[PDB]
Design an enzyme around this catalytic site. Structure first.
Site, PDB file in Angstrom:
ATOM      1  N   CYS A 122       0.817  -1.208   0.000  1.00  0.00           N
ATOM      2  CA  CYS A 122       0.000   0.000   0.000  1.00  0.00           C
ATOM      3  C   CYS A 122       0.836   1.236   0.000  1.00  0.00           C
ATOM      4  O   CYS A 122       1.546   1.488   0.978  1.00  0.00           O
ATOM      5  CB  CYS A 122      -0.900   0.049   1.265  1.00  0.00           C
ATOM      6  SG  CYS A 122      -1.992   1.472   1.284  1.00  0.00           S
ATOM      7  N   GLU A 149      -4.769   3.781 -10.830  1.00  0.00           N
ATOM      8  CA  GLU A 149      -5.533   2.569 -10.597  1.00  0.00           C
ATOM      9  C   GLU A 149      -6.688   2.481 -11.606  1.00  0.00           C
ATOM     10  O   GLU A 149      -6.923   1.428 -12.190  1.00  0.00           O
ATOM     11  CB  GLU A 149      -6.100   2.521  -9.165  1.00  0.00           C
ATOM     12  CG  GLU A 149      -5.083   2.393  -8.053  1.00  0.00           C
ATOM     13  CD  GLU A 149      -5.790   2.334  -6.667  1.00  0.00           C
ATOM     14  OE1 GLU A 149      -6.330   1.245  -6.315  1.00  0.00           O
ATOM     15  OE2 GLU A 149      -5.837   3.373  -5.966  1.00  0.00           O
ATOM     16  N   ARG A 197       0.028   4.585   2.910  1.00  0.00           N
ATOM     17  CA  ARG A 197       0.058   4.360   4.356  1.00  0.00           C
ATOM     18  C   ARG A 197       0.427   5.584   5.195  1.00  0.00           C
ATOM     19  O   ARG A 197       0.336   5.530   6.420  1.00  0.00           O
ATOM     20  CB  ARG A 197       0.987   3.194   4.700  1.00  0.00           C
ATOM     21  CG  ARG A 197       0.394   1.813   4.448  1.00  0.00           C
ATOM     22  CD  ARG A 197       1.484   0.787   4.708  1.00  0.00           C
ATOM     23  NE  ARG A 197       2.396   0.635   3.561  1.00  0.00           N
ATOM     24  CZ  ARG A 197       3.553  -0.012   3.623  1.00  0.00           C
ATOM     25  NH1 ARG A 197       3.939  -0.544   4.796  1.00  0.00           N
ATOM     26  NH2 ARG A 197       4.333  -0.127   2.525  1.00  0.00           N
ATOM     27  N   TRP A 222      -9.217   6.121  -0.768  1.00  0.00           N
ATOM     28  CA  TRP A 222      -9.568   6.843  -1.999  1.00  0.00           C
ATOM     29  C   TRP A 222      -8.571   6.454  -3.077  1.00  0.00           C
ATOM     30  O   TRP A 222      -7.534   5.853  -2.796  1.00  0.00           O
ATOM     31  CB  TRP A 222      -9.570   8.350  -1.792  1.00  0.00           C
ATOM     32  CG  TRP A 222      -8.310   8.906  -1.178  1.00  0.00           C
ATOM     33  CD1 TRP A 222      -7.119   9.190  -1.823  1.00  0.00           C
ATOM     34  CD2 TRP A 222      -8.123   9.280   0.184  1.00  0.00           C
ATOM     35  NE1 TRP A 222      -6.211   9.701  -0.931  1.00  0.00           N
ATOM     36  CE2 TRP A 222      -6.797   9.779   0.307  1.00  0.00           C
ATOM     37  CE3 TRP A 222      -8.948   9.239   1.324  1.00  0.00           C
ATOM     38  CZ2 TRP A 222      -6.274  10.247   1.529  1.00  0.00           C
ATOM     39  CZ3 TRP A 222      -8.429   9.701   2.549  1.00  0.00           C
ATOM     40  CH2 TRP A 222      -7.104  10.207   2.634  1.00  0.00           C
TER      41      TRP A 222
HETATM   42  C1  HEM Z   1      -6.453   6.469   1.868  1.00  0.00           C
HETATM   43  C2  HEM Z   1      -6.044   6.343   0.612  1.00  0.00           C
HETATM   44  C3  HEM Z   1      -5.337   5.067   0.109  1.00  0.00           C
HETATM   45  C4  HEM Z   1      -4.565   5.069  -0.965  1.00  0.00           C
HETATM   46  C5  HEM Z   1      -4.260   6.296  -1.878  1.00  0.00           C
HETATM   47  C6  HEM Z   1      -4.114   3.713  -1.181  1.00  0.00           C
HETATM   48  C7  HEM Z   1      -3.288   3.284  -2.182  1.00  0.00           C
HETATM   49  C8  HEM Z   1      -3.160   1.971  -2.579  1.00  0.00           C
HETATM   50  C9  HEM Z   1      -2.841   1.489  -3.920  1.00  0.00           C
HETATM   51  C10 HEM Z   1      -2.615   2.377  -5.178  1.00  0.00           C
HETATM   52  C11 HEM Z   1      -2.807   0.145  -3.870  1.00  0.00           C
HETATM   53  C12 HEM Z   1      -2.528  -0.829  -5.040  1.00  0.00           C
HETATM   54  C13 HEM Z   1      -3.902  -1.377  -5.456  1.00  0.00           C
HETATM   55  C14 HEM Z   1      -3.836  -2.158  -6.733  1.00  0.00           C
HETATM   56  O1  HEM Z   1      -2.885  -1.965  -7.523  1.00  0.00           O
HETATM   57  O2  HEM Z   1      -4.763  -2.990  -6.965  1.00  0.00           O
HETATM   58  C15 HEM Z   1      -3.073  -0.254  -2.497  1.00  0.00           C
HETATM   59  C16 HEM Z   1      -3.074  -1.541  -2.013  1.00  0.00           C
HETATM   60  C17 HEM Z   1      -3.452  -1.949  -0.748  1.00  0.00           C
HETATM   61  N1  HEM Z   1      -3.863  -1.128   0.293  1.00  0.00           N
HETATM   62 FE1  HEM Z   1      -4.069   0.933   0.148  1.00  0.00          FE
HETATM   63  N2  HEM Z   1      -4.535   2.925  -0.121  1.00  0.00           N
HETATM   64  C18 HEM Z   1      -5.369   3.719   0.649  1.00  0.00           C
HETATM   65  C19 HEM Z   1      -6.061   3.254   1.757  1.00  0.00           C
HETATM   66  C20 HEM Z   1      -5.969   1.964   2.287  1.00  0.00           C
HETATM   67  C21 HEM Z   1      -6.645   1.538   3.503  1.00  0.00           C
HETATM   68  C22 HEM Z   1      -7.616   2.462   4.284  1.00  0.00           C
HETATM   69  C23 HEM Z   1      -6.268   0.268   3.751  1.00  0.00           C
HETATM   70  C24 HEM Z   1      -6.684  -0.657   4.920  1.00  0.00           C
HETATM   71  C25 HEM Z   1      -7.340  -0.149   5.973  1.00  0.00           C
HETATM   72  C26 HEM Z   1      -5.340  -0.133   2.705  1.00  0.00           C
HETATM   73  C27 HEM Z   1      -4.725  -1.356   2.581  1.00  0.00           C
HETATM   74  C28 HEM Z   1      -4.230  -1.882   1.406  1.00  0.00           C
HETATM   75  C29 HEM Z   1      -3.898  -3.259   1.161  1.00  0.00           C
HETATM   76  C30 HEM Z   1      -4.051  -4.467   2.131  1.00  0.00           C
HETATM   77  C31 HEM Z   1      -3.400  -3.298  -0.272  1.00  0.00           C
HETATM   78  C32 HEM Z   1      -2.951  -4.536  -1.071  1.00  0.00           C
HETATM   79  C33 HEM Z   1      -4.293  -5.057  -1.623  1.00  0.00           C
HETATM   80  C34 HEM Z   1      -4.116  -6.350  -2.369  1.00  0.00           C
HETATM   81  O3  HEM Z   1      -3.087  -7.046  -2.183  1.00  0.00           O
HETATM   82  O4  HEM Z   1      -5.033  -6.671  -3.151  1.00  0.00           O
HETATM   83  N3  HEM Z   1      -5.156   0.931   1.871  1.00  0.00           N
HETATM   84  N4  HEM Z   1      -3.214   0.884  -1.730  1.00  0.00           N
HETATM   85  C1  LIG Z   2      -4.896 -12.571  -6.603  1.00  0.00           C
HETATM   86  C2  LIG Z   2      -4.761 -11.365  -5.704  1.00  0.00           C
HETATM   87  C3  LIG Z   2      -3.862 -11.277  -4.619  1.00  0.00           C
HETATM   88  C4  LIG Z   2      -3.804 -10.102  -3.842  1.00  0.00           C
HETATM   89  N1  LIG Z   2      -2.963  -9.951  -2.784  1.00  0.00           N
HETATM   90  N2  LIG Z   2      -4.635  -9.083  -4.159  1.00  0.00           N
HETATM   91  C5  LIG Z   2      -5.505  -9.149  -5.188  1.00  0.00           C
HETATM   92  C6  LIG Z   2      -6.398  -7.973  -5.496  1.00  0.00           C
HETATM   93  C7  LIG Z   2      -6.431  -7.816  -7.007  1.00  0.00           C
HETATM   94  C8  LIG Z   2      -5.035  -7.633  -7.586  1.00  0.00           C
HETATM   95  N3  LIG Z   2      -5.331  -7.003  -8.854  1.00  0.00           N
HETATM   96  C9  LIG Z   2      -6.686  -6.482  -8.946  1.00  0.00           C
HETATM   97  C10 LIG Z   2      -7.231  -6.640  -7.537  1.00  0.00           C
HETATM   98  O1  LIG Z   2      -6.974  -5.463  -6.769  1.00  0.00           O
HETATM   99  C11 LIG Z   2      -8.200  -4.884  -6.349  1.00  0.00           C
HETATM  100  C12 LIG Z   2      -8.071  -3.375  -6.298  1.00  0.00           C
HETATM  101  C13 LIG Z   2      -7.595  -2.987  -4.918  1.00  0.00           C
HETATM  102  C14 LIG Z   2      -7.822  -1.504  -4.687  1.00  0.00           C
HETATM  103  C15 LIG Z   2      -6.879  -1.162  -3.560  1.00  0.00           C
HETATM  104  C16 LIG Z   2      -7.081   0.232  -2.997  1.00  0.00           C
HETATM  105  C17 LIG Z   2      -7.480   0.346  -1.669  1.00  0.00           C
HETATM  106  C18 LIG Z   2      -7.640   1.613  -1.128  1.00  0.00           C
HETATM  107  C19 LIG Z   2      -7.368   2.720  -1.923  1.00  0.00           C
HETATM  108  C20 LIG Z   2      -6.961   2.587  -3.250  1.00  0.00           C
HETATM  109  N4  LIG Z   2      -6.839   1.347  -3.761  1.00  0.00           N
HETATM  110  C21 LIG Z   2      -5.588 -10.291  -5.982  1.00  0.00           C
END
Ligand code: HEM
Ligand SMILES: Cc1cc(N)nc(C[C@@H]2CNC[C@@H]2OCCCCCc2ccccn2)c1
Ligand code: HEM
Ligand SMILES: Cc1cc(N)nc(C[C@@H]2CNC[C@@H]2OCCCCCc2ccccn2)c1
Ligand SMILES: C[C@H](O)[C@H](O)[C@H]1CNc2nc(N)[nH]c(=O)c2N1
Ligand SMILES: C[C@H](O)[C@H](O)[C@H]1CNc2nc(N)[nH]c(=O)c2N1
Ligand SMILES: [Zn+2]
Lengths: 411, 407
Positions: free
Chosen positions: B106, B283, B109, B278
């Site tokens: 993320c 994205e 953070r 947000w």
């Molecule tokens: C507040 C604005 C936030 C921004 C700008 C942001 C930004 C991002 C971005 C750009 C990604 C990559 C997503 C992707 O490529 O699919 C991400 C992943 C992630 N974020 Fe954030 N985030 C925010 C809030 C949060 C919050 C509130 C949480 C948890 C309470 C969080 C937890 C995570 C986690 C666990 C991932 C990895 C998700 C996955 O593996 O699918 N984020 N974040």
């Molecule tokens: C297979 C898999 C593993 C993993 N760790 N996570 C995912 C999530 C998938 C990875 N590619 C598309 C999808 O991600 C969902 C979009 C998450 C949005 C995250 C976000 C959260 C808060 C603020 C901005 N963005 C998939």
């Protein structure tokens, strides 16, 4: 054991068995991944196993594994090691070795080309003057008036570590950098320290923005010596833009021949500390990194100014817009002058075809995603979407410390 | 044991000690790096609870206090007698905030300590889950001034009574396979849409149909609910220069709300914990719009721009990419819906990394996810070495429920 990689765009899954032949360390452990860290005299005892592993691979590749020629060669190498503490590679082995170091280079997106490498054997070289001559010949051959040909020149291997051949330049052709009393930099900021060394060694610096550096060449552990590459052998491309006529007045140019000269080639436990090699550029190396890194030529602002982009907020994406135009300019300029270059779409598409071929024919293809994905437009290239496995195979190219840090000055 | 990370733009070197606390495994070995792979009892539980309570009591500067020792005691007794335990509200909030703090993928953070935690552990039915989620959606959306939130449903018990949101995000668009052979809508959601239809949803069969929630309470069969349409804030996409852009008929929703992850705190597992922040503009504009397996719009945009599409080397894909991304950011900003661009977000992450290094001894970060999917090296994170390792509390991937669930 079998390891799978998935392409998330195509759902193609590939199976890696080649990783089983890896023995060297990655830097990672079960508790930590160091995938984004840039940098994560042998005994008789260590040497014969390494020679044997290599000769086994070489004899397998030629479909002579276990032959009398293979067994005779192992015996010959064993005897040479116990008698002289080292051994010499046959020319065939050297060529195979150098090609394989490239094939195994996990940070190289250009490896579809690995089997087409001209190897110049410079192991009979004894002096810095002799090194200069070999390097001029390599530059002329590789340049080929713009129709670039990949090549490597291999100088004598390490003996006691006190007699190393080294090219002090990090690439054969690079531009000088000069730190000004006012803290600005003229030319390429990447090369300030090396430029200072050249000057100290007696180079007369023109002090301009694109001064081609002299070669600083160390033979046989002696103090390095300065040589100027004949300018007629240094092909350069003035950078212009197909639509923007003011782009030329930025006064940019770049050299055609990318020629890494600071790496160490390991083949069968032997160490080739001077092994300059060259291919051709992928456009982003110049247009993204050399021109637009903040710590390099740093032209983004001036370009965006000329384009009259809204520069008050990053969210206008002015830097991204200017970035694309600079990269169009680089590809256009090289293509117009008929100097080989590859765009990042072509290069990555070819790499994926190479990688799939390697999986099918070789059982794997170690690849470092961090380096393979281009530094612009990542996810619109197929490599962004490709899972990769990074592991170390030999023969290999390795980083080595800059020689000015380790050299014992003779005087 | 003590590790250095260097920034190659600035030469700044930071020392990571925080990694020594890591417990879970990365997927890498000394022989192989898997950095780019997307998915690499009573006796077990008390050590996990203790590790967490120790960090908690440390954080409020009462480590080794009577109240620390008394809580460990209380939790020990509760696990011994009930096979599980319940977190105090203060612990739940601390754990959720830290799961975000520890999320190595993320970039956002810097925000981690500003998280509104909605305690839904009293929820018992799927209708209850629907109510809690609408309230989360409305709170977080805040008429476009988005606020980070998480809603935490009851923890795993014996594993046959799981709460799950079947949706991968609270708000997503349907995907349908056509006679044409093509895909209408979002191709990422075909299977899920099909499950919806088979469970009763009547689909409008459009390009941007907000999916219904499929909610599973107490290990029961999941039920359908449509999120009130007026709570789903959407943005029509236009370009500040190209008059034709609006006619592609593109829109996106304002609220990114991941709903398929598992929150682990002190060994307890929260299998339904939808959370939202947000968007970073890439994205939507790079991934959702331009991935070949997503809305895949690059070709259409390039054509309206009249670019030379004959040769890859004209960089027509790259030009169209930037314009799509400019339009996303412009559309969100004009309608006053919170969005961050990739320059601003990554600049903030670097600042956050320095804070974490100074104050905590490190920051786990996955470079492969942190570097934006366009313009990598013109953002500062490209030049920043990162160490990736797994700390708890954490958010984890979990299997899609439809493979797991028995009806
Ligand atoms: C507040 C604005 C936030 C921004 C700008 C942001 C930004 C991002 C971005 C750009 C990604 C990559 C997503 C992707 O490529 O699919 C991400 C992943 C992630 N974020 Fe954030 N985030 C925010 C809030 C949060 C919050 C509130 C949480 C948890 C309470 C969080 C937890 C995570 C986690 C666990 C991932 C990895 C998700 C996955 O593996 O699918 N984020 N974040
Ligand atoms: C297979 C898999 C593993 C993993 N760790 N996570 C995912 C999530 C998938 C990875 N590619 C598309 C999808 O991600 C969902 C979009 C998450 C949005 C995250 C976000 C959260 C808060 C603020 C901005 N963005 C998939
Ligand atoms: C033929 C055209 C080639 C192309 C387009 C190409 C492309 C590239 C690119 C873009 C990089 C990353 C460069 C950077 O970001 O600094 C690279 C790295 C590398 N390539 Fe190639 N390459 C080519 C030929 C070669 C040759 C001939 C060799 C050696 C025989 C080679 C071996 C390497 C090695 C060892 C690296 C890692 C360099 C380092 O760690 O500094 N490549 N390649
Ligand atoms: C510290 C360090 C480690 C390492 N492995 N490699 C380098 C090389 C540095 C990293 N940044 C700039 C420089 O890269 C040199 C350019 C590589 C050219 C590769 C190439 C070779 C052939 C054809 C096209 N391109 C530095
Ligand atoms: C810290 C990080 O690993 C570093 O900036 C890397 C990232 N990826 C790269 N990729 C290539 N091709 N060349 C590079 O110099 C780098 N630099
Ligand atoms: C295979 C590779 O790991 C995969 O395409 C990744 C790369 N980096 C990513 N980075 C982010 N933020 N989100 C992603 O979905 C991905 N996908
Ligand atoms: Zn790793």
């Amino acid at each position: 054991r079998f390891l799978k990689v998935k392409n998330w765009e195509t759902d193609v899954v590939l199976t890696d068995t080649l990783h089983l032949k890896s023995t060297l360390e990655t830097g990672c452990t079960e508790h930590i991944c160091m995938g984004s860290i840039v940098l994560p005299v042998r005994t008789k005892d260590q040497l014969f196993p390494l020679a044997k592993e290599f000769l086994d691979q070489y004899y397998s590749s030629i479909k002579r594994f276990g032959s009398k020629a293979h067994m005779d060669r192992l015996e010959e190498v064993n005897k040479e090691i116990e008698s002289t503490s080292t051994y010499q590679l046959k020319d065939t082995e050297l060529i195979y070795g150098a090609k394989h170091a490239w094939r195994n280079a996990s940070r190289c997106v250009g490896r579809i080309q690995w089997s087409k490498l001209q190897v110049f054997d410079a192991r009979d070289c004894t002096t810095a003057h002799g090194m200069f001559n070999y390097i001029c010949n390599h530059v002329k051959y590789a340049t080929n008036k713009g129709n670039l040909r990949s090549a490597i020149t291999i100088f004598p291997q390490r003996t006691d570590g006190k007699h190393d051949f080294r090219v002090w330049n990090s690439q054969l052709i690079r531009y000088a950098g000069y730190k000004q009393p006012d803290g600005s930099t003229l030319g390429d900021p990447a090369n300030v320290q090396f430029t200072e060394i050249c000057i100290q060694q007696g180079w007369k610096a023109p002090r301009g923005r694109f001064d081609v550096l002299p070669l600083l060449l160390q033979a046989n552990g002696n103090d390095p010596e300065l040589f100027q590459i004949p300018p007629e052998l240094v092909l350069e491309v003035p950078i212009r833009h197909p639509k923007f006529d003011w782009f030329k007045d930025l006064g940019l140019k770049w050299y055609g021949l990318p020629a890494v000269s600071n790496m160490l080639l390991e083949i069968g436990g032997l160490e080739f500390s001077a092994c300059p090699f060259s291919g051709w550029y992928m456009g982003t190396e110049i247009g993204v990194r050399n021109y637009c890194d903040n710590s390099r030529y740093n032209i983004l602002e001036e370009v965006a100014k000329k384009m009259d982009l809204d520069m008050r907020k990053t969210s206008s994406l002015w830097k991204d817009q200017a970035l694309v135009e600079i990269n169009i300019a680089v590809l256009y300029s090289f293509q117009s002058d008929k100097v080989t270059i590859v765009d990042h779409h072509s290069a990555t598409e070819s790499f994926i075809k190479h990688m799939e071929n390697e999986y099918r024919c070789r059982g794997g293809c170690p690849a470092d995603w961090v380096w393979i994905v281009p530094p612009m437009s990542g996810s619109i290239t197929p490599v962004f979407h490709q899972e990769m496995l990074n592991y170390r195979l030999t023969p290999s190219f390795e980083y080595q410390p800059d020689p000015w840090n380790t050299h014992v000055w003779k005087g």
